[PDB]
Design a protein around this ligand. Sequence first.
Ligand SMILES: C[NH+](C)c1cc(NC(=O)CNC(C)(C)C)c(O)c2c1C[C@H]1C[C@H]3[C@H]([NH+](C)C)C(O)=C(C(N)=O)C(=O)[C@@]3(O)C(O)=C1C2=O
Ligand SMILES: [K+]
Ligand SMILES: [K+]
Ligand SMILES: [K+]
Ligand SMILES: [K+]
Ligand SMILES: [Mg+2]
Ligand SMILES: [Mg+2]
Ligand SMILES: [Mg+2]
Ligand SMILES: [Mg+2]
Ligand SMILES: [Mg+2]
Ligand SMILES: [Mg+2]
Ligand SMILES: [Mg+2]
Ligand SMILES: [Mg+2]
Ligand SMILES: [Mg+2]
Ligand SMILES: [Mg+2]
Ligand SMILES: [Mg+2]
Ligand SMILES: [Mg+2]
Ligand SMILES: [Mg+2]
Ligand SMILES: [Mg+2]
Ligand SMILES: [Mg+2]
Ligand SMILES: [Mg+2]
Ligand SMILES: [Mg+2]
Lengths: 70, 167, 122, 86, 39
Amino acid sequence: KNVLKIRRRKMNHHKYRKLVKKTRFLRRKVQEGRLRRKQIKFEKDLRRIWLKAGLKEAPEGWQTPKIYLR
Amino acid sequence: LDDDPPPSTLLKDYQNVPGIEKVDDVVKRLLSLEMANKKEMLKIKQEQFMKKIVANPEDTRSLEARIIALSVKIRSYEEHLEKHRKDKAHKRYLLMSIDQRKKMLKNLRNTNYDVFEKICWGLGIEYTFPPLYYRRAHRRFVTKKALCIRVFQETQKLKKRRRALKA
Amino acid sequence: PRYELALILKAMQRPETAATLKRTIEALMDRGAIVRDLENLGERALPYRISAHSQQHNRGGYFLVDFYAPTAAVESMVEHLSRDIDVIRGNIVKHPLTQELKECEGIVPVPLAEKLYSTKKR
Amino acid sequence: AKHLKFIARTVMVQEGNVESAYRTLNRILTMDGLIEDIKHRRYYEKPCRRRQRESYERCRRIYNMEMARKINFLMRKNRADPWQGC
Amino acid sequence: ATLNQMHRLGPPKRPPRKLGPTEGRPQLKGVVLCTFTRK
RNA sequence: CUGUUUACCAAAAACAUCACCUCUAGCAUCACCAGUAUUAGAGGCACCGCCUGCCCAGUGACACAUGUUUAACGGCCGCGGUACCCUAACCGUGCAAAGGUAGCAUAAUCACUUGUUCCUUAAAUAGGGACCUGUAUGAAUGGCUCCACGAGGGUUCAGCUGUC
RNA sequence: AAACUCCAGUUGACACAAAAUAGACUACGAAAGUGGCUUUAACAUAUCUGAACACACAAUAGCUAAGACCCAAACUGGGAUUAGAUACCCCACUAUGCUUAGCCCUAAACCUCAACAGUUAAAUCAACAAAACUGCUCGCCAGAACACUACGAGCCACAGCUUAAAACUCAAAG
Ligand SMILES: C[NH+](C)c1cc(NC(=O)CNC(C)(C)C)c(O)c2c1C[C@H]1C[C@H]3[C@H]([NH+](C)C)C(O)=C(C(N)=O)C(=O)[C@@]3(O)C(O)=C1C2=O
Ligand SMILES: [K+]
Ligand SMILES: [K+]
Ligand SMILES: [K+]
Ligand SMILES: [K+]
Ligand SMILES: [Mg+2]
Ligand SMILES: [Mg+2]
Ligand SMILES: [Mg+2]
Ligand SMILES: [Mg+2]
Ligand SMILES: [Mg+2]
Ligand SMILES: [Mg+2]
Ligand SMILES: [Mg+2]
Ligand SMILES: [Mg+2]
Ligand SMILES: [Mg+2]
Ligand SMILES: [Mg+2]
Ligand SMILES: [Mg+2]
Ligand SMILES: [Mg+2]
Ligand SMILES: [Mg+2]
Ligand SMILES: [Mg+2]
Ligand SMILES: [Mg+2]
Ligand SMILES: [Mg+2]
Ligand SMILES: [Mg+2]
């Protein structure tokens, strides 16, 4: 079999790795905003729970841990 | 639960040999577990468990005897791994033996509950019922539920404080 | 179980070899060994130059110790011989007479393998 | 080496026939594999390459020994044709 | 697939037919914005 | 980050600092230390996260046998031409120890300049986000992010009020 | 050429590196993998199949420390070649290859051929390849390319991996 179909993936992958290298700092800034919005979205969900369960405040002694951090 | 087999006991092959009581003291220790491999000790341990539990001591192809024989291996693998923490091949042999025993124990339980109870007692095996859903407990989950349990406990302590309002 | 100690000594004189052999046999006994026999294979020239304990050896007395010991005694005896400066080389092996040789039936010549390729006209 | 010298790979020269001695030495080294091993040991032959070469040589020996066996088997029939003309 | 697999999966469903430029409409009414030629 | 400072015009972005790294030292009866290289001294830098590129020619240290050494002092290119213009993947030539890498960039930073654009006001030489790109940004003289923190500097919603 | 010239050549002493021959053998292991010697421990299941909501593994290369240093070596620097040579050739040297303790979880991880039970009878049988098939089960596939991609999610992974699309385009791709 020829390798004409491997060579397409070969170039795709090569270009992608070079693209990530060129933009790894732009991509990092975008990824930090995403994990930040992700933690907010998580807290809303937990908040929504106890508000729907009638409770007016968070359970006594509860803190929402920052699960989306390094 | 920690009963260690005596080390002087004779090999399973020379136990019945008649007249062995008249041999020299040296010959007794040449035919003992002191001068034998670790596998020779496992034959005696299996023999003791089999005579204790199995109704017919000579039946080796019975579901009971197999569980006994498999439990002695599980014991032998666990001790091996206590010294060799990175022996991944023997780590795999342990986890497969354990699943094969649960498989034997599930069958015995469903066929002969009488002897199933005898096995679980003699070998100190606690049969557990397999969990239904094998789900991964990642952080988001492990926190959601941890909160949802605390919320429920709080709502519990508001009916208590609302029946005291009927008063 | 049964072992054999292939013991190369330092080509000494009788008092020293007897002294050295006695040490080794006691150290086996001290670790729970039942010594079965002692054999003298004779002082030969070494197949090659063995450097042991800051000495260059060319000759040595070959001995064999047939003994029974618990499996844990092997590591301890191995380490003991490391520190004896009259041993050129010592190795403990399972006794060769413990293993029973299975009866062999004979060389069976291998027929040419067949049906490796389809019988089509290429 | 810790071994004795002038024992291994050593050939005695007869009647000053150096050419014949060196020739027999070469044969010994070749017949034992030493020559070919030294040549392959000049550059590192990677494990993938070593396996590709050993497979090739072993497929070659089989074919070569089977062709040699067929040539030797049919050598008897190279004699003169007995029915020349029909 | 086996019969057990063919049961577990069910019918072959269907790709939701993608709409066309006319958005599934016989015709459409537009306002000319510019006129040009393309080769 | 808590801390520290110009008692009496500066409390700070300055210093220290956890951390990281460079240098020196094989040893006792007064510091270090009644210690002993996982130690102890001399310094840099500044938690952490991502990193910390290239240069040993010069000057210093060390080796003083050809040398080694930048988390030592320091440094880190030109002149012409080529896709309308812009720019040059590219081309020619020269020069250096190496030719400023990764980042970051309308600002504690600012020729033009109050750039341009998007937000923000009715109105912005303010502030925020970007883009342009650097007379003279740039990697422990640390570079770039980020939690928390600050009588620090700046912008702001709402309210509040004799600030008006 | 540059390089070395505290260098070469006999001889002696000397590994924490790697394991001629045997091996024309074809064994062990779930796969990855395993070929110097010794010893200890040790190679699951007395039906079969079966976890992409789970567990335990997984070459090489990488990452985090802490050591080792014979050689080999990305990078880098010189020598050479060339129109250029950021290569192929030469020399030198590093990460790395080793040990220990944790990660990372990927391969043309392919013998691209699933497990179990069977059949060479028929009509073998597109081509080629490693002959055509039956029962049973699981796992996978449904033009090309966008795409080992984006979003989302998980993950000790922050230039990562695993899952994984769509729009525009084409009349082919194979
Ligand atoms: C008068 N020139 C020499 C000058 C002066 C200043 N600033 C000052 O002199 C400031 N003086 C104070 C400190 C206030 C007393 C300057 O600040 C500058 C410049 C030069 C320009 C050159 C610009 C030029 N282009 C974009 C118009 C250009 O091609 C370059 C270049 N490198 O080739 C530039 O970088 C340029 O944009 C630039 O940055 C300049 C200045 O910054
Ligand atoms: K203050
Ligand atoms: K501004
Ligand atoms: K602006
Ligand atoms: K302050
Ligand atoms: Mg003052
Ligand atoms: Mg004061
Ligand atoms: Mg004053
Ligand atoms: Mg003051
Ligand atoms: Mg400071
Ligand atoms: Mg830091
Ligand atoms: Mg630097
Ligand atoms: Mg730059
Ligand atoms: Mg701005
Ligand atoms: Mg200026
Ligand atoms: Mg300027
Ligand atoms: Mg500067
Ligand atoms: Mg400096
Ligand atoms: Mg803090
Ligand atoms: Mg303070
Ligand atoms: Mg402030
Ligand atoms: Mg107001």
